[PDB]
Amino acid sequence: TTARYDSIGGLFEDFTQSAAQRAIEVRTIFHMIGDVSGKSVLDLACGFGFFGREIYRRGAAKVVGVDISEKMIELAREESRKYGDPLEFHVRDVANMEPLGQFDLVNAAWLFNYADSVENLRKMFKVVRASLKPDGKLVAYTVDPDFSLAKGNFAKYGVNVLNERAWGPGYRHDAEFVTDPPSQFSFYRWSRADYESAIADAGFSHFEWQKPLLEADDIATHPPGFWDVFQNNCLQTGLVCKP
């Protein structure tokens, strides 16, 4: 098992602090999550641990993060040492992992768009269902199936999408985060039908897609038209699933 983000490392945090789109996805994700006081939380594809750590700061009781990258987990562990917080981390490929516990909330910000096959997409959703209490929920952030590179690039928002190539029944996109120097990565755009089948066959009886929450203050702080591609050719979507 290999990890692209072993070569990205601290550049990912640089991206989160410069990219115009990051504030929108953070707001949208916490809108979906809601109150976390007292809840047990599993943060999948956790990176340096941003969401799980913020969730702990907002009141969570137990927070575990999982990422495929040894480098990203080293950074996540370093952040928890700096702040003295109780987050625990594990290096795993979520597509192949065994349950680590039963959680009230699974957060998966930029997990499912790294599944490299529909088989692995379906395995990830099964792993998530097996990690959830019956009254729990999954909150996810992923690639909108309806994105099309022909309808405009996302470089100005922080993600330069290089191409769009067929990959089984979906598409693979090679991309760069807008950092200095740019950080290469690749992701997958699976169809809405394949997502919804993966969700149902994993045992989730309810799901909802959530469009990113752009606000008046975001519009005011950029030139006119800045957000047109973001709004009219969305690369990102939220997703909430319940057992």
Ligand X SMILES: Cn1c(=O)[nH]c2nncnc2c1=O
Site residues, ligand SAH (CB under 6 A): 3, 5, 45-47, 50-51, 67-69, 72, 93-95, 109-110, 114
- Binding-residue total with ligand X (CB under 6 A): 7
Smallest gap from residue 187 Cβ to ligand SAH (A) = 9
Which of 69, 183, 236, 237 is in the footprint of ligand X by CB under 6 A?
Answer: 236
Of the two residues 28 and 69, which places its CB atom closer to ligand SAH in the complex? 69
Of the two residues 51 and 187, which places its CB atom closer to ligand X in the complex? 187
Pick one of ligand SAH, ligand X, none as the site partner of residue 45 (Cβ within 5 to 8 A by kind).
ligand SAH
Angle between helices 70-83 and 10-18 (to 10 degrees): 70
Pick one of ligand X, ligand SAH, none as the site partner of residue 190 (Cβ within 5 to 8 A by kind).
none
Contact between 235 and ligand X by CB under 6 A: the answer reads yes
**What is the footprint of ligand X within residues 94-113 (CB under 6 A)?**
110, 113
Smallest gap from residue 143 Cβ to ligand X (A) = 5
**64 marked among binding-site residues:** no
**93 marked among binding-site residues:** yes
Q: What single-letter amino acid sits at 219?
A: I
**What is the footprint of ligand X within residues 28-57 (CB under 6 A)?**
none
Q: C-alpha distances in angstroms, 242 versus 46, 122, 231, 235?
A: 20, 16, 27, 24
Which of 48, 187, 204, 227 is in the footprint of ligand X by CB under 6 A?
Answer: 187
**67 marked among binding-site residues:** yes
Of the two residues 87 and 143, which places its CB atom closer to ligand X in the complex? 143
Binding positions for ligand X, rule: CB under 6 A: 110, 113, 143, 159, 187, 235-236
Binding-site sequence positions for S-adenosyl-L-homocysteine: 22, 67, 93-94
